[PDB]
Design a protein around this ligand. Structure first.
Ligand SMILES: [Mg+2]
Ligand SMILES: [Zn+2]
Ligand SMILES: [Zn+2]
Ligand SMILES: [Zn+2]
Lengths: 84, 43, 130, 114, 156, 196, 47, 559, 65, 160, 266, 138
DNA sequence: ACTCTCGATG
RNA sequence: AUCGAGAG
């Protein structure tokens, strides 16, 4: 079972924990010489690169938000709003 | 050294309290803190 | 140019637990509906009781403050005691009574009048002579 | 144990230059100069001698941290006046005053007893 | 009257009458419909729960009831037009800013607020110096004292 | 620490030039902060300072005995007799600039004692060291080059923050991390894992 | 300046700390608690 | 509990802490030796292969350097013993365990870790000497001084976890605490007393010093503000130059007592657009208060700007204070002669009232209050009288103090000390108490052998007429000693029982959090709160606002 | 131990002034203040340096090894 | 007691009333007394409140008392925290203490409860009844050394 | 001359009491700082202990050896050991002097600074000779020997700056006071009743005119008159202390000027 | 010669001790402390000197009667952690670890009780020219 | 029923 | 392992 892309009740805004997890994961990927999907423009620090990569929504990850019953809603990083 | 050689230990109502009778026999100020306060006294 | 010009009569001088700044209380000798409260550096320009000081408000004489060089520069004052502050409140007592509140680096001022070209602007040069 | 060497207060390190001239990006025609292995003894004096020059708009020194013997001196002058010349004039003025003071003290000392 | 609520409206308003430099001697380019329907439609966006069923919606209105009271109290037509003299642009900016700040003020899912609570209570108990009060009373409360030291009956 | 329960460590050292100085050219051996006075109410510290100053000047031995009729007023009078501010204050000059200070400074001899808690005997750092045998965790002790206990309260703080990965790192990669084999049936560590 | 009053065991200086105790052969009366069936107890520690 | 719930860890350190006015809020002073000891594994990437090559080239002992080099196979190269510590071709994918360098995210901690602010992420600034140097305004959430206090420091070992530290546990992010919906950090001690001394209307600053202060601010626009005084001498006020530290778009308004937009006492606070209009800046403003300047700047300009604000304010105020000076002597505990006389006669009339009440009670005319003993009523009355005496004399001593009185100045600034401190140091230390009641009869019918039996007089039951300036008598000294003893005792007991209570609360509310439906549940899924906090807001983003609909007349409401 | 060679505070040499101090004390039968004053110790820091000092080396020399 | 009360004109005005304080508690019979207001009467024993006026009134009284203890020292703690504690104490149906007798007898995980107070005996009785551990408890993942479902680990990250 | 002026009030071997006229505050302060810390001096930097059967510890003795005032007259024609192209130290940078003392009489055998004997070749330069202002002619009391106690060691003295160690301090306490009437108002006097009766009156009040209450505050006045008293330790004469202070400050300004001259290189 | 007696607490219960020997005899200074007049007559014993109620560590504290008692306690605790000369024969003893002050100094403010504790002979600290001042903020 | 630091003795 | 002393 799953949850359809419509009728999703969770916050459309990305949580601070989701943001930290995404930035950390992406920076972990960059830290092991993985392809960068944005212009470096001088930046070398993988964390900063991941941040700039998030600001342009160039991160191909997705968030599986778990509901206490067992249900789960998927939220692509490109879709999630980052207001923090 | 002088202080250590004149020390009082107490095993185990309000023995920690500086009792009136301690006057002239036990120092009112000299005592450990945090744990054995009042229990350990100096003459 | 000029925004205000009047002569006031010092009615009270009060050193409120200070020794460099005294609160002054004066009134206009022209309008019987005009009065003035003003913090004054007595250490620089001493203000005794019952004095007739000439008071002026200006807007000029932003950019960084260059030292008065040489000058050999347009002072546009030749007063005795000059300050620079900022209006922060326009209190309307009556229709025939309008008051303004200036702040000269903390040295406050309350000018009560009637007829004014005192807008809420950083420009607030207070010039006092004699 | 972790304490730095004493001579690091006046002896320059490896590659460390005495003066570091930097174009101040805040206000135009301004400069920030990093003095290495120097303290307030030089900073305060030079800064105070820069304020005597009436063609100098801004002049201020600071020691960002007492651990390290170094201080930054910011100078801003009027257009058509290179600040390095202001620093040089200040320095020469200092040296002249000190020389005159030395001569005067010597002549005054040559008149004493005991 | 003074109570902890999200979004400081005062700072937003006094920021509005500063960002746009509005003068206190000029007619506002607003309408009654602008203010009334605008504020009424502002409460629609202040979301805490985002369900589509009746229960979640009731929980929503019950969750934003107080802040909405504050909102209507501060954004009343008389008050908006006479007390601050806001313009159209300034008013819309106020609404949007309020909505944004409210959405920011929502608690983030995952927030271990249990531990946060236990510490927020436990820590100020450390800095503590006629009934029984202070640490012994707290200890009585947490232990659920069968026989408290100072049982009292306050009768009105 | 002084002789009045006023303890504290050294924040920084200043050479005599940077140190504030009285007109006599006397520089303090020590600078303490006035905020450590009113909240602790150690008036006898101040009194000790004043008395010790007067005794220093006069070349006598100041009597600081408990129950005596020696008062701050008499001491002050004596200090004034020796040509100083009766309340111990002294006009001082900032060492950096040479300019006078506005407020005058309480300045005088005070018997300070050097406690035995020194930094180089306290300082500790470990990046992967010797482990214990029973628990395979970092050993206990600075002298044994051990690690610091990431206590329960620390864990609670990391939970409150939300840093789960950090909590996992402290509890695996930082301390003891082990790989075991589990049977898919009984689910116990009965597995005889003959590797290679 | 050494005042003594200590022992030397295996080269290590030992100090016997005075031990505080309740005096014996003294008669003392104590009021018992409320849930207790007895109201007062007069006791004595014989040595 | 000793090996699973909490265990010893690698990559950690511990040292004596010290304050540093020239460090930023989110910084931590790390001794060179510790910096060489602790290490971070960094994978060789094209972005940093040069820097890493240099670090390996330096090796250990020299900072910044490296300790070990891990290859593809998993072999560890010890740079301090290897024969190839000089020539190493760093292949991509290899790990390099380098020394901790500047701007690295570390976890600063101080036991006992009561709340989440006891562990905060700092930036590393490697420094000489063997102490952990931290910023003054971070003293409060850690609850630490520098009287020998030690702190611990942990180091993350991957990108994701240091991301966790920097993005979650960062000190600027912990400024406004969700505990008391207010900032838990602020300006204290020298910076507070100094910022009080600076914002006085008498405080004027001449050109040179103004230029120095201006330069001291890192976020300075390089624009000299027009002096409040033009003629006859160009002068700046403390408020004026302090306004530079406060960012633009900052509006702060607070009315105290007689604050009437003109403030004859220069009280209250008005700050418009990063410019302080009027009022003395102290604890009520730049402290860790609810409607404080820190709260406002944080919620408005952001945490970074706010931390940088801590920096600025501290630098400027500490500079001005450094070149102004502040002290405290015994003279700040000496009230005037006639004041001491009024204090003495006040104590006298107090003891006289106690004497009268005593004689009345002994005459069996004392009528007991409903619900208590004659003797209890007597005790209550006498204690109340002596308390009113201490407060009376104390307030006399406080009134007698001048505005130049350093103690009173610190009290005004809110830096340290209070009324009772002045009252006891200068006037009268008051009645000593043990277990609530005044000094009971240890000996038969008397408190001390120097008293006669049945002596309920104030001085006998432990009243101290003298102040700390005057000196205590033997009886007074011993009674005070009893009081203090009880103090230390119940202090220890308090820290113990609290120590346990905290743990109990934590282990109770352990697994409680907010799920992705704003429903506060536990590990069982059991609902504790359907909407967290009954409103669904985070405690951090909440300020005390007035509801001006609930108050006032119906006429005023309508109007 | 033994008289400190120079004063801590300023830096004045006070190591050569110990024996002379003792002589001014016992031979001329002066008080400590006047003895300290005659030795050119005007500042109370150096005055302290000598007045406060306790010569312990004389007790240390009582041992034979 | 002084008291703020709405005046017929509108504004809140201080109207002082007489209030009977009492050493002793027996709410079950005092509120039924003719003469006093039986709707405003209160005791500092939330136990009796819980017995007489229900579990919700017990909740309100419990929070009132805790808040009173916190604010007694002059300190201030936000509502949601104390509300959380009180709620978790009152959600079981009765008053659950914060001790080994109270919440430690709940139907949570074995490891979790074993990580507090009675450790070994819990493991014993859990081994006897053959309990199932959900391993979604914090201390359980702490023991197992896995990333607990806490904040960051409160979800899953995948790739699309 | 033409600039700043000096007026010597008192003059002796150990002290110079003078008045500095026509000078900026910063220059007087900087002069004081240089005089305190940045003047070159010869002092014991290395100690090689052969035999030490005295009560005092090795480095305990070495320390107080370091503080011994040595002759630093011709110190300017001596060189820094860090500059000299020699191994460790030589005769062009360092002065080596030995110390050999032994308990002879039954009474306590004192070990002074006069027992130090210059060994290295001074080749004409007045340097190394331990200052003895002692009346008896002994100097600094270094140590005390019993009956059979011996102290044999060798001292290597090097040129050093007091900024590196206070043992190289050419001066002790420098008295410094400007405006004895507080006419500039740089100091807000603390008081209980009267401001003038409580605070003592400076000697330097005799050399300036008291303020008139009828006169307002002079806000355009600066600091011109300074009252200084420089005290030497013996290593360097007072006049030479202040003069070499001046020349040192001048030289380190000239080094910055020279640096500016050098930074114009491509 | 029956001039001094040994009194324990049990016997202390039934006597009337005078605090000072001047309390046997049958305009003032506002500076001094307020001492209660002797409202008793039938004395039997007199205190030798009140300062003897303290211990060895507390007798080192200067003006302890002008301090808040817990501060006296803390000083009584930290007095045992100060360095100095613990014995004259420290150079011929082989202790596990011992610290000796380079230049010990007898305090300028002393107690009359320091005479018997040999603290002026074996001090544990130095007279530092202290300055209570806000300076660099360090 | 908080972290440390040592010392002893089996 | 346990015991003793001490640090906030
Ligand atoms: Mg502490
Ligand atoms: Zn199996
Ligand atoms: Zn000296
Ligand atoms: Zn050489």
């Amino acid at each position: 079972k799953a949850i359809p892309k419509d009728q999703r009740a969770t916050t459309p805004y990305m949580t601070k924990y989701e943001r930290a997890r995404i930035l950390g994961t992406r920076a972990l990927q960059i830290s092991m010489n993985a392809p960068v999907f944005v212009d470096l423009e001088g930046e070398t620090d993988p964390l900063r690169i991941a941040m700039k990569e998030l600001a342009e929504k160039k991160i191909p990850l997705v968030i599986r938000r778990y509901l206490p019953d067992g249900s789960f809603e998927d939220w692509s990083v490109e879709e999630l709003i980052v207001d923090l | 050294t002088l202080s250590h050689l004149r020390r009082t230990n107490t095993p185990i109502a309000k023995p920690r309290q500086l009792h009136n009778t301690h006057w002239g026999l036990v120092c009112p100020a000299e005592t450990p803190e945090g744990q054995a306060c009042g229990l350990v006294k100096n003459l | 140019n000029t925004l205000f010009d009047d002569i006031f009569q010092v009615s009270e001088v009060d050193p409120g637990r200070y020794n460099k700044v005294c609160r002054i209380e004066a009134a206009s000798t022209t309008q019987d509906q005009c009065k003035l409260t003003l913090d004054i550096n007595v250490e620089l320009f001493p203000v005794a009781a019952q004095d007739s000081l000439t008071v002026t408000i200006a807007s000029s004489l932003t950019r960084s403050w260059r030292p008065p060089q040489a000058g050999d520069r347009s002072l546009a004052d030749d007063y005795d005691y000059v300050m620079y502050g900022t209006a922060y409140k326009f209190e309307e007592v009556s229709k025939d009574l309008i008051a303004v509140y200036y702040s000269f680096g903390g040295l406050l001022m309350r000018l009560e009048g009637n007829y004014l070209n005192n807008l809420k602007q950083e420009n607030a040069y207070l010039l006092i002579r004699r | 144990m972790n304490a730095p060497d004493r001579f690091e207060l006046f002896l320059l390190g490896e590659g460390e230059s005495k003066l570091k001239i930097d174009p101040d990006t805040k206000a135009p025609n301004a400069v920030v100069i990093t003095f290495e292995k120097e303290d307030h003894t030089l900073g305060n004096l030079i800064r105070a001698e820069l304020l005597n020059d009436r063609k100098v708009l801004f002049a201020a020194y600071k020691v960002e941290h007492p651990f390290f013997a170094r201080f930054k001196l910011r100078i801003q002058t009027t257009e058509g006046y290179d600040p390095k010349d202001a620093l040089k004039n200040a320095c020469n003025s200092i040296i002249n005053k000190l020389g005159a003071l030395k001569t005067n003290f010597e002549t005054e000392w040559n008149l004493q007893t005991l | 009257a003074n109570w902890p609520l999200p979004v400081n409206i005062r700072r937003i308003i006094q920021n509005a009458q500063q960002t746009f430099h509005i003068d206190h001697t000029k007619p506002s380019d607003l309408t009654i419909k602008d203010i009334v329907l605008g504020v009424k439609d502002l409460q629609e966006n202040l979301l805490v729960l985002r369900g589509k069923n009746e229960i979640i919606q009731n929980a929503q209105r019950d969750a934003v009831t107080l802040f909405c009271c504050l909102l209507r109290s501060r954004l009343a037509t008389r008050r908006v037009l006479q007390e601050y003299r806001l313009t159209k642009q300034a008013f819309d900016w106020v609404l949007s800013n309020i909505e944004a700040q409210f959405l920011r003020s929502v608690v983030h899912p995952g927030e271990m607020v249990g531990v946060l609570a236990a510490q927020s209570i436990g820590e100020p108990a450390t800095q503590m110096t006629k009934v029984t009060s202070g640490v012994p009373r707290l200890k009585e409360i947490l232990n659920v004292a069968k026989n408290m030291k100072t049982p009292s009956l306050t009768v009105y | 620490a002084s002789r009045h329960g006023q303890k504290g460590t050294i924040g920084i050292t200043y050479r005599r030039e940077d140190m504030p100085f009285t007109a006599e050219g006397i520089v303090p051996d020590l600078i303490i902060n006035p905020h450590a006075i009113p909240s602790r109410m150690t008036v006898a510290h101040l009194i000790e300072c004043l008395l010790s100053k007067v005794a220093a000047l006069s070349g006598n031995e100041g009597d600081a005995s408990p129950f005596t009729d020696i008062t701050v007023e008499g001491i002050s009078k004596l200090l004034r007799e020796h040509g100083y501010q009766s309340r111990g204050f002294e006009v001082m000059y900032n060492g950096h600039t040479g300019k006078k200070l506005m407020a005058q400074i309480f300045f005088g001899p005070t018997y300070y004692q050097r406690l035995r808690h020194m930094v180089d005997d306290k300082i500790h750092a470990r990046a992967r060291g010797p482990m214990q045998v029973l628990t395979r965790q970092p050993v206990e002790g600075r002298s044994r080059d051990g690690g610091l206990r990431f206590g329960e309260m620390e864990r609670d703080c990391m939970i409150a923050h939300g840093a789960a990965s950090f909590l996992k790192e402290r509890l695996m990669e930082a301390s003891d991390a082990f790989r075991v084999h589990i049977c898919g049936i009984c689910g116990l560590m009965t597995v005889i894992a003959k590797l290679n | 300046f050494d005042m003594g009053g200590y022992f030397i065991i295996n080269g290590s200086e030992k100090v016997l700390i005075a031990q505080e105790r309740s005096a014996g052969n003294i008669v003392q009366v104590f009021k018992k608690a409320a849930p207790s069936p007895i109201s007062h107890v007069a006791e004595i520690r014989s040595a | 509990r000793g090996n699973l719930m909490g265990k010893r860890v690698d990559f950690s350190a511990r040292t004596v802490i010290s304050g540093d006015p020239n460090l930023e809020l989110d910084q931590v002073g790390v001794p060179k030796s510790i910096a060489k000891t602790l290490t971070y594994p960094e994978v060789v990437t094209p972005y940093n292969i040069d820097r890493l090559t240099q670090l390996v080239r330096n090796g250990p002992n020299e900072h910044p350097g490296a300790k070990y080099v891990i290859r593809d196979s998993g072999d560890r190269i010890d740079l301090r013993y290897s024969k190839r510590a000089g020539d190493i071709q760093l292949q991509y994918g290899w790990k390099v365990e380098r020394h901790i360098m500047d701007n690295d995210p570390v976890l600063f901690n101080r036991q006992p870790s009561l709340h989440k602010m006891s562990m905060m992420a700092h930036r590393v600034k490697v420094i000489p000497y063997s102490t952990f140097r931290l910023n003054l305004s971070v003293t409060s959430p850690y609850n630490a001084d520098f009287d020998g206090d030690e702190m611990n420091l942990h180091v993350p070992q991957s990108e994701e976890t240091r991301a966790e530290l920097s993005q979650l546990c960062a000190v600027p992010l912990q400024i406004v605490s969700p505990q008391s919906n207010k900032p838990c950090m602020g300006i204290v001690q020298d910076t507070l007393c100094g910022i009080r001394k600076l914002t006085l209307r008498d405080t004027f600053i001449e050109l040179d010093q103004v230029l120095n202060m201006l330069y001291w601010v890192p976020d300075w626009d390089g624009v000299i503000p027009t002096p409040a005084i033009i003629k006859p001498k160009p002068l700046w006020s403390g408020k004026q130059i302090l306004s530079v530290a406060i960012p633009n778009g900052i509006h702060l308004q607070r009315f105290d007592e007689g604050t009437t937009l003109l403030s004859p006492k220069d009280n209250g606070m008005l700050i418009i657009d990063g410019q302080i209009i009027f009022g003395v800046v102290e604890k009520k403003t730049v402290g860790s208060s609810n409607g404080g300047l820190i709260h406002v700047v944080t919620r408005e300009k952001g945490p970074q700007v706010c931390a940088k604000l801590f920096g600025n304010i501290q630098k400027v105020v500490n500079f001005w204070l450094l070149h102004n000076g502040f002290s405290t002597g015994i003279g700040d505990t000496i009230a005037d002669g006639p004041t001491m006389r009024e204090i003495t006669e006040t104590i006298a009339e107090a003891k006289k009232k106690v004497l009268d009440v005593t004689k009345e009670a002994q005459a069996n005319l004392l009528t007991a209050k409903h619900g208590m003993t004659l003797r209890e009523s007597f005790e209550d009355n006498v204690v109340r009288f002596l308390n009113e005496a201490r407060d009376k004399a104390g307030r006399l001593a406080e009134v007698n103090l001048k505005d130049l009185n350093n103690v009173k100045q610190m009290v005004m600034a809110g830096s340290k000390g209070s009324f009772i401190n002045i009252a006891q140091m200068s006037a009268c230390v008051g009645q000593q108490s043990v277990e609530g009641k005044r000094i009971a009869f240890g000996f038969v019918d008397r408190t001390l052998p120097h008293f006669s039996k049945d002596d309920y007089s104030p001085e006998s039951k432990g009243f101290v007429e003298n102040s700390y300036l005057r000196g205590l008598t033997p009886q007074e000294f011993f009674f005070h000693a009893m009081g203090g003893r009880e103090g230390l005792i119940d202090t220890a007991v308090k820290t113990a029982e609290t120590g346990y209570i905290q743990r109990r609360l934590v282990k109770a509310l352990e697994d409680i959090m907010v799920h992705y439906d704003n429903t506060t549940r536990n590990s069982l899924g059991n609902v504790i709160q359907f909407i967290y906090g009954e409103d669904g807001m985070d405690a951090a983003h909440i300020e005390k606002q007035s509801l001006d609909t609930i108050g006032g007349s119906d006429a005023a409401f309508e109007k | 131990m033994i008289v400190p060679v120079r004063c801590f505070s300023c830096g004045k040499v006070v190591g050569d002034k110990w024996e002379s101090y003792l002589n001014l004390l016992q031979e001329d039968e002066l008080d400590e203040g006047t003895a300290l004053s005659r030795l050119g110790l005007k500042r109370y820091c150096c005055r302290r340096m000598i007045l406060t000092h306790v010569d312990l080396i004389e007790k240390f020399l009582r041992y034979n090894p | 007691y002084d008291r703020k009360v709405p005046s017929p004109t509108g504004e809140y005005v201080k109207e002082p009333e007489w209030v009977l304080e009492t050493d002793g508690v027996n709410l079950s019979e005092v509120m039924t007394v003719p003469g006093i207001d039986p709707t405003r009467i209160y005791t500092n024993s939330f136990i009796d409140i819980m017995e007489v006026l229900g579990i919700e009134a017990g909740r309100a009284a419990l929070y009132k008392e805790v808040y009173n203890v916190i604010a007694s020292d002059g300190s201030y703690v936000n509502y949601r925290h104390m509300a959380l504690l009180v709620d978790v104490m009152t959600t079981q149906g009765g008053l659950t203490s914060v001790t080994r007798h109270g919440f430690n007898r709940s139907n949570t995980g074995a490891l979790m409860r074993c990580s507090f107070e009675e450790t070994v005996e819990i493991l014993f009785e859990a081994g006897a009844s053959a309990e199932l551990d959900d391993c979604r408890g914090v201390s359980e993942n702490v023991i197992l050394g896995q990333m607990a479902p806490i904040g960051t680990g409160a979800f899953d990250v995948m790739i699309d | 001359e033409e600039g700043p002026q000096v007026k010597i009030r008192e003059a002796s071997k150990d002290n110079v009491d003078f008045i500095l006229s026509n000078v900026d505050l910063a220059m007087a302060n900087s002069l004081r700082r240089v005089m305190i810390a940045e003047i070159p001096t010869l002092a014991i930097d290395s100690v090689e202990v052969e035999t030490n059967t005295t009560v005092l510890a090795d480095e305990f003795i070495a320390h107080r050896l370091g503080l011994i005032p040595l002759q630093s007259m011709d110190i300017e024609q001596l060189e820094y050991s860090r500059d000299c192209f020699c191994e460790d130290h030589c005769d062009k940078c360092s002065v080596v002097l030995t110390l050999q003392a032994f308990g002879e009489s039954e009474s306590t055998t004192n070990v002074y600074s006069k027992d130090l004997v210059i060994v290295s070749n001074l080749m004409g330069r007045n340097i190394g000779h331990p200052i003895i202002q002692d009346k008896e002619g002994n100097g600094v009391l270094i140590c005390k020997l019993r009956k059979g106690q011996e102290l044999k060691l060798t001292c290597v003295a090097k040129k050093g700056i007091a900024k590196e160690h206070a043992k190289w301090g050419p001066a002790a306490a420098i008295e410094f006071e400007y405006d004895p009437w507080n006419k500039l108002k740089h100091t807000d006097y603390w008081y209980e009743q009267d401001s003038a009766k409580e605070w003592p009156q400076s000697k330097n009040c005799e050399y300036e005119d008291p303020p008139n209450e009828g006169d307002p505050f002079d806000y355009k006045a600066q600091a011109d008159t300074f009252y200084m008293n420089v005290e030497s330790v013996g290593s360097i004469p007072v006049d030479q202390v202040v003069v070499r202070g001046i020349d040192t400050l001048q030289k380190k300004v000239a080094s910055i000027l020279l640096a500016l001259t050098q930074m114009d290189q491509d | 010669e029956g001039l001094v007696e040994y009194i324990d607490a049990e016997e202390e219960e039934s006597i009337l001790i005078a605090m000072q020997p001047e309390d046997l005899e049958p305009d003032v200074d506002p500076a001094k402390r307020i001492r209660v007049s002797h409202h008793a007559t039938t004395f039997t014993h007199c205190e030798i000197h009140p300062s003897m109620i303290l211990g060895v560590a507390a007798s080192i504290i200067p003006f302890p009667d002008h301090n808040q008692s817990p501060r006296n306690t803390y000083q009584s605790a930290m007095g045992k952690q100060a360095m100095g000369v613990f014995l004259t024969n420290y150079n011929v003893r082989m202790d596990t670890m011992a610290n000796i002050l380079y230049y010990p100094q007898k305090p300028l403010g002393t107690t009359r009780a320091m005479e018997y504790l040999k603290f002026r002979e074996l001090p544990a600290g130095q007279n530092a020219i202290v300055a209570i001042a806000c300076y660099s903020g360090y």
